[PDB]
Design an enzyme around this catalytic site. Structure first.
Site, short mmCIF file in Angstrom:
data_model
loop_
_atom_site.label_atom_id
_atom_site.label_comp_id
_atom_site.label_asym_id
_atom_site.label_seq_id
_atom_site.Cartn_x
_atom_site.Cartn_y
_atom_site.Cartn_z
N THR A 1 2.25 5.80 -15.40
CA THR A 1 1.73 7.12 -15.70
C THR A 1 2.03 8.14 -14.60
O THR A 1 2.09 7.81 -13.41
CB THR A 1 0.19 7.08 -15.88
OG1 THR A 1 -0.20 6.05 -16.81
CG2 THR A 1 -0.36 8.42 -16.32
N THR A 19 3.59 8.51 -19.79
CA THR A 19 3.72 7.19 -19.20
C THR A 19 4.70 6.29 -19.93
O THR A 19 4.99 6.49 -21.11
CB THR A 19 2.33 6.49 -19.16
OG1 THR A 19 2.37 5.34 -18.31
CG2 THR A 19 1.83 6.10 -20.54
N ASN A 21 3.64 3.06 -19.24
CA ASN A 21 2.60 2.07 -18.96
C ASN A 21 2.83 1.56 -17.52
O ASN A 21 2.55 2.30 -16.55
CB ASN A 21 2.45 0.96 -19.97
CG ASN A 21 1.26 0.08 -19.65
OD1 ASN A 21 0.35 0.51 -18.92
ND2 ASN A 21 1.25 -1.14 -20.16
N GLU A 40 3.99 -0.24 -23.50
CA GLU A 40 2.64 0.19 -23.86
C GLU A 40 1.90 -0.82 -24.71
O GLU A 40 0.67 -0.74 -24.82
CB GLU A 40 2.72 1.52 -24.61
CG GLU A 40 1.66 2.51 -24.24
CD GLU A 40 1.91 3.13 -22.89
OE1 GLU A 40 2.94 3.84 -22.71
OE2 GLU A 40 1.04 2.96 -22.00
N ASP A 43 -1.47 -2.39 -23.76
CA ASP A 43 -2.75 -1.70 -23.84
C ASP A 43 -3.56 -2.10 -25.07
O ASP A 43 -4.76 -1.78 -25.13
CB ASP A 43 -2.50 -0.20 -23.82
CG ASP A 43 -2.34 0.35 -22.41
OD1 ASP A 43 -2.50 -0.40 -21.41
OD2 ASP A 43 -2.01 1.55 -22.30
N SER A 73 -6.45 5.10 -21.36
CA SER A 73 -7.39 5.73 -20.44
C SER A 73 -6.93 7.11 -20.00
O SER A 73 -7.63 7.76 -19.23
CB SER A 73 -7.60 4.85 -19.21
OG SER A 73 -8.10 3.56 -19.56
N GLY A 93 -3.28 6.03 -13.14
CA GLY A 93 -4.12 5.00 -12.57
C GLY A 93 -4.70 4.01 -13.56
O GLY A 93 -5.67 3.32 -13.21
N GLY A 94 -4.16 3.94 -14.77
CA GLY A 94 -4.65 3.00 -15.77
C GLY A 94 -6.13 3.16 -16.00
O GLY A 94 -6.64 4.26 -16.25
#
Ligand SMILES: N=NCC(=O)CC[C@H](N)C(=O)O
Lengths: 193, 337
Positions: A1, A19, A21, A40, A43, A73, A93-94
């Site tokens: 991201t 992003t 991911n 991705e 996720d 997120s 930052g996930g």
């Protein structure tokens, strides 16, 4: 991201988080075209209750289904007051993204810190699982009396091994603009006048 | 509002320079965002992209908007596709290689945003990014460190090293194939990426690598405009990402609960142990709800209203223990009776 924030002289604002991911995504480059493909799919919940790369879990609502968007997120944000933009911000930052935004908002709106200090301040993260684990980064690690008290309460403190976000923010005060780029990264801000 | 100029906060110097050039010549924030997003797809390839997806929150002419250009699972995806003969997750299958990819949304997202709000010509907004791909940008130290982390993960299972092997800290990195791709996008927009030469190359890579994405997946991709999440407190209005982001609901809960617990925060210093403990107690409840309820809102009936109702936020705020850690086993999704 990564994230960027823009405000134009008409008061229009864009906050954009995007992003692959993980960094560099799946590692697959489209031969002949030169771009990387995302990873991705991680996720989604791959198996109920099993944590993904960011330590987060799920069940049916975020199970894999064809044509479905995987839960994110990412939280590109714009704060306004009286119909005018006042703050534009976002971050990578996930699973730490929205807790980092929350901390920056607390720093600006509750502690009344200058934007640069609000972004540079230590940030930490907890997410229920792993149990009682607070994550910190090497930019501003938990140390000293605060770390010791948290450990005395029963927390486990872990260096997550990557900086806790990369906030890129613009604040508007009346007609005046200021930018802040997180010292955790290599960002640059410019007021264009 | 006539402000004293525009502004950009970008994750590198190249995105900043491009956004500023667009604003200086009279492009709007969306024009600048398009040029910046394509620039970072060249200069910040660890995350900026045309092969991924994302979200854009906008405030244009005093009105909030949200654009969802998140990837979608391929039509051939299935619930257990990452599980082995034991029913366990196959290490890194959802992270490395072609089966880890969702259908990319970024080119569609940037197109949709520009079509609705842009002032400058699309093809001209791609020229900065094309230039950085053709003649290069300087690789950053932190960027190289992320490259090394990725190489450790990819372990020779992909073609990454054939394209990014020459990325070296402090040195200029050029991407001629990507420059040609961006030229096609400048001329044909999403038609190239989803229906044209780039689509064909993506499909060929899927065939080569055993991926799932097909022409049908690409032609069916749509970005979606959604109502942004709105959170009000202390006279401010925060607009942020709704589902399929968990961040809007999370922020509504984090902010709402913190406000409910103002007496416990009074006099507490930033990043003291008590402050961090309080945030952690709030985060426990937020992540309990996130794991149980949240997902693509068109694929299940997600109880967004119940999870953001002021009475619910007050109830969850009551669970926060200001003096000790709550038992993790006893933290439950908040709608469970
Ligand atoms: C970075 O920010 C990765 C973000 C992650 N895939 C998420 O969408 O929440």
């Amino acid at each position: 991201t990564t994230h960027f924030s823009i405000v134009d002289k008409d008061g229009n604002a864009v906050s954009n988080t995007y992003t692959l991911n993980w960094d560099f995504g799946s590692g697959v480059v489209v031969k002949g075209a030169g771009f990387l493909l995302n990873d991705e799919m991680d996720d989604f919940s791959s198996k109920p209750g099993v944590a993904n790369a960011f330590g987060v879990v799920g069940s049916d609502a975020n199970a894999i289904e064809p044509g479905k968007r995987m839960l994110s997120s990412m939280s590109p944000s714009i704060v306004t007051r009286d119909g005018h933009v006042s703050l534009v911000l976002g971050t990578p930052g996930g699973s730490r993204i929205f807790t980092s935004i929350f901390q920056v908002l607390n720093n600006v709106y509750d502690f009344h810190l200058p934007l640069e200090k609000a972004v540079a301040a230590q940030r930490v993260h907890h997410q229920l699982l792993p149990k009682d684990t607070i994550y910190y980064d090497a930019y501003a690690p938990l140390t000293g009396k605060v770390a010791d008290e948290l450990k005395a309460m029963g927390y486990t403190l872990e260096d997550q091994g990557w900086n806790m976000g990369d906030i890129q923010a613009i604040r508007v005060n009346g007609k005046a603009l200021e930018t802040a780029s997180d010292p955790r990264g290599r960002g640059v801000g410019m007021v264009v006048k | 509002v006539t402000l004293d100029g525009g502004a950009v906060a970008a994750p590198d110097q190249y995105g900043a320079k491009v956004a500023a050039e667009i604003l200086k010549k009279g492009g709007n924030a969306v024009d600048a965002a398009v040029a910046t997003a394509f620039t970072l797809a060249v200069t910040y390839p660890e995350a900026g992209n045309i092969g991924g997806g994302g979200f854009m929150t906008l405030y244009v002419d005093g009105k909030p908007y949200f654009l969802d250009y998140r990837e979608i699972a391929p039509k051939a995806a299935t619930k257990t596709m990452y599980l082995n003969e034991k029913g366990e997750v196959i290490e890194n299958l959802s992270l490395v290689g072609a089966k880890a990819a969702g259908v990319p949304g970024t080119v569609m997202g940037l197109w949709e945003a520009h079509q609705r709000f842009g002032k400058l010509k699309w093809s001209e907004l791609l020229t900065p990014a094309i230039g950085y791909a053709q003649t290069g940008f300087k690789v950053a130290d932190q960027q190289y460190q992320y490259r090394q982390d990725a190489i450790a993960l990819f372990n020779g299972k992909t073609n990454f090293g054939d394209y990014f092997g020459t990325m070296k800290p402090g040195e200029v990195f050029k991407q001629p194939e990507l420059a040609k791709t961006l030229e096609r996008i400048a001329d044909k927009g999403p038609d190239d990426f989803y229906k044209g030469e780039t689509a064909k190359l993506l499909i060929a890579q899927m065939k080569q690598d055993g991926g799932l994405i097909t022409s049908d997946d690409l032609v069916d991709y749509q970005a979606k405009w959604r109502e942004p999440m709105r959170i009000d407190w202390q006279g401010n209005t925060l607009y942020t990402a709704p589902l399929p982001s968990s961040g809007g609901i999370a922020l509504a809960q984090l902010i709402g609960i913190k406000e409910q617990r103002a007496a416990d925060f009074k006099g507490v210093e930033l990043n003291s142990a008590k402050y961090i403990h309080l945030l952690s107690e709030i985060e426990k409840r937020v992540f309990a709800d996130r794991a149980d309820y949240l997902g693509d809102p068109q694929f299940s009936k997600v109880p967004v209203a119940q999870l953001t109702d002021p009475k619910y936020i007050a109830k969850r705020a009551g669970e926060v223990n200001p003096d000790a850690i709550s038992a993790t086993e006893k933290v439950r999704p908040g709608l469970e009776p």
